[PDB]
Design a binder for this molecule. Sequence first.
Ligand SMILES: OC[C@H]1O[C@](O)(CO)[C@@H](O)[C@@H]1O
Ligand SMILES: OC[C@H]1O[C@](O)(CO)[C@@H](O)[C@@H]1O
Ligand SMILES: OC[C@H]1O[C@](O)(CO)[C@@H](O)[C@@H]1O
Ligand SMILES: [Cu+2]
Ligand SMILES: [Cu+2]
Ligand SMILES: [Cu+2]
Ligand SMILES: [Cu+2]
Ligand SMILES: [Cu+2]
Ligand SMILES: [Cu+2]
Lengths: 334, 334, 334
Amino acid sequence: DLKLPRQKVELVAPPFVHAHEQATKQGPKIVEFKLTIEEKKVVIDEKGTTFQAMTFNGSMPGPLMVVHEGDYVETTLVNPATNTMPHNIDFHSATGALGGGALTLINPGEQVVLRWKATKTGVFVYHCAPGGPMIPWHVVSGMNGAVMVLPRDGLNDGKGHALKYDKVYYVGEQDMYVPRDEKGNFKSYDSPGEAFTDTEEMMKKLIPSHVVFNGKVGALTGKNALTANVGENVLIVHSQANRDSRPHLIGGHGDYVWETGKFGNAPEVGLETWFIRGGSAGAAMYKFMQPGIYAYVTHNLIEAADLGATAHFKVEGKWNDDLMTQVKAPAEIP
Amino acid sequence: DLKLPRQKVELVAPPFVHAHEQATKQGPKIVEFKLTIEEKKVVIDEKGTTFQAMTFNGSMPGPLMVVHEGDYVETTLVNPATNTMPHNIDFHSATGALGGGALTLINPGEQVVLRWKATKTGVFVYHCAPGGPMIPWHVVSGMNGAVMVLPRDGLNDGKGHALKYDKVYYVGEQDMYVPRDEKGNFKSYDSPGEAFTDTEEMMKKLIPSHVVFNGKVGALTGKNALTANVGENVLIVHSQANRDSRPHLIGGHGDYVWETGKFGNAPEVGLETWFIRGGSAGAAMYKFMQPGIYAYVTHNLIEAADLGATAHFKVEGKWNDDLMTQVKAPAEIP
Amino acid sequence: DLKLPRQKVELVAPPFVHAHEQATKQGPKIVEFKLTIEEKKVVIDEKGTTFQAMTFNGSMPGPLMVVHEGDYVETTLVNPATNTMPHNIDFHSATGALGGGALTLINPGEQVVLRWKATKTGVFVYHCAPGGPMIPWHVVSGMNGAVMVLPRDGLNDGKGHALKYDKVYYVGEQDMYVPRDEKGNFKSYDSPGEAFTDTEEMMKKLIPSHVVFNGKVGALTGKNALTANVGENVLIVHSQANRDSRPHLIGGHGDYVWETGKFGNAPEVGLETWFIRGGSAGAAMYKFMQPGIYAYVTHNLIEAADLGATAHFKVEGKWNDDLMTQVKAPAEIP
Ligand SMILES: OC[C@H]1O[C@](O)(CO)[C@@H](O)[C@@H]1O
Ligand SMILES: OC[C@H]1O[C@](O)(CO)[C@@H](O)[C@@H]1O
Ligand SMILES: OC[C@H]1O[C@](O)(CO)[C@@H](O)[C@@H]1O
Ligand SMILES: [Cu+2]
Ligand SMILES: [Cu+2]
Ligand SMILES: [Cu+2]
Ligand SMILES: [Cu+2]
Ligand SMILES: [Cu+2]
Ligand SMILES: [Cu+2]
């Protein structure tokens, strides 16, 4: 007999986030979301390597869901008959039934509706978890995303001062395990089922072949670079459902960082690199001070440069010579 | 000339913890413990894989020792003549002589008695460390446990409020390195000595074959599941003497977490996943809100599901539909 | 038109640090440093294994630079014509142009001068980053160091009390990737260029062959052990530019630790083991209470004992029997 107002949310593909309020005068609502599972073969790198992906809403990561503390989140999970496997969903933000996993197992052709109360603030992972050895396999195949539960008064610095972001991006990092053949080339498979045996063997050795943001090498570069202007406060939500990450904004800092991702704790200030524990999401805010290109990386630099984990920001505005200047350009040594 | 009262403790096998007070009106005491080293071949998985273990008190991990700040901990370490190797003990809680290691080296047939003052609060690792390449080998063979040094006033939230647990469990995570033969089956050995060469070769490649709680795959499941009731505040002490872990209670949270394990620091609140640095112990408290099965895992899900690192909690009590409800059971898609 | 006083610093090889003030009554200055790149073949272990190193100032790590908040750091980077490759420098302490990387790319025979304002306090990594796959390779070849930006009032405990160190050491940890030949021996190369192909192949598998402090196995042991006396407060700055580390002082503690390395945040107290995220520097202070040998290690004990990551401290002073005592020396079991 829960008779609160209902509000539908139109989810958007990462790294964008659906429109929301930070601080709100709204009371609790039932916020309604729909996720549709899609299994699909995708290209994950510039050499054309393929991968048997399984996704929420067709994307890796799944879309960011945003609600406020005390809202009730009502999710319709749909597993169309064009898929081959059972799936479910586990929200780390939710309390009971294995985060909802025990109440959302659906075969192809079925859908289910789960409601949970958002009692804990922060950014949290959600992922598929359909039992036993299937749990890691579905997660590293792409079935993970995040939810952000905001305080009703918005974010604060722990010292009584509001922290308002001008925009938010969601960067989902995915460790992928693509086996190679005898000659050393990556293998392609006709189905997730067929990829399973070789993939599981590789997974158990714990070293990924690729580590990517937003599903592919170079996904957040070029035309699809993240953007900002000098003076803008940007929130970057970062998730990793299986393996640790160490985010770093090259040329900037984390001005305010919740590395464990939970807004009941004050943020740390002035970080160079932060740490996202496997199975969690964290958040970092930075006010841009300089224009130009920034790279956002995990600062295992082999992963960043060689396995796929680099995004770009293109920042517009005026160069600040007080902060940094080339005193003398490259010249022959005297 | 230390003339304080003496108190004997009867240690109990993990994941249980010997009876103790949280807040106490006792002053400092000499608390007396005995550890007896046992080298033994054990079965570590459901397929019957064997492992040359070396243990304190016959268990992996070694038992949790519990004392209060300012107590003196007096340990009798015994290395029976049925063992083959020298051993010692290093307490991370202790100050000087390599944590006691430099004062406790004993050959088979010998015992030693060490006393140290508990000047630092928290949960701390203890482990064998008998010099050079032997140090990692003895530790990953099972020779590690933990000690908890409580404040005399018990635990607090950093905001002046007492945090009292209704029960405590100790989960010791062990990375194990079992070599395989040419055909790909795990190897068995007649002695720790014989296992050394092949084991060291594998250890240096840094990828474990198994990652287990309480010594074996499935140790804390079934009849030996951890238990609680809705409304109970449970403290989970987690240690890892060699390699990082990322504990996560599936379907719950860390309400209060000391991830670095030290009670001089306020706990963080409302975590989804926490991080236990290799060579440390941490502690997390959670008040159960829902009945049913929970899994406690490291949230590298490949390790949890495929290499052995999953425990269960079975929780009794009344389901709370406000927190979570199946709005519509699995049904055919319209 | 920046007309502040100028101050030259004579850099010193790690683990020592150039003379500096903690708290200062000086106002902002332009502090001038020079770094000269050297590519060179070095011996990294006791068996005589060689490695194609690339360094700032001839050392791994590069020297620690120390300044105060609000100073301007003016660095002359020199790439002599005896080197074979372009190089640059990226300061994590600096704001804009990829930390200076985009303004400091120099071919052999060139030098450049960069100035940046030290707006953020803490210890920060600096490293070479000359684009694409070259970035990880130059960093794991040795091209990394750290800078420490002190508050003008010196360090504090977060509770209003000054924390003054009697000495500081800089420990730079380096993950190295040396390939092996068919028979299993480490390979030697005539040039960095020639080492590249085999080295990159190994790097992408993410497991180092060696993990060393100050450039070599056993660098900070023997004649070159770190030293202290009972009663001395020592600051240990630890950096790792590519891979996580878990520092631990065997027989001691971290009394005050900034594991994320940033002095805008209060230190944690009473740690056993702390965590240095890959791409960062952290700092820990400890007041020695006992004489004798301590080991400082990463507490992945396989790395510490088998791959090279152990330093020693030799501490002079009076043994404290209250803190720790051998009650009964090794004796036959009754
Ligand atoms: O930012 C969150 C933090 O801010 C405060 O409300 C005020 O200090 C704390 O109680 C909380 O942990
Ligand atoms: O919970 C431990 C914390 O609680 C306090 O005593 C009170 O804020 C702090 O000084 C300490 O760090
Ligand atoms: O030590 C640094 C910390 O000390 C304080 O200035 C006083 O509590 C804090 O504002 C800061 O985070
Ligand atoms: Cu699934
Ligand atoms: Cu999970
Ligand atoms: Cu031993
Ligand atoms: Cu140890
Ligand atoms: Cu370089
Ligand atoms: Cu960097």
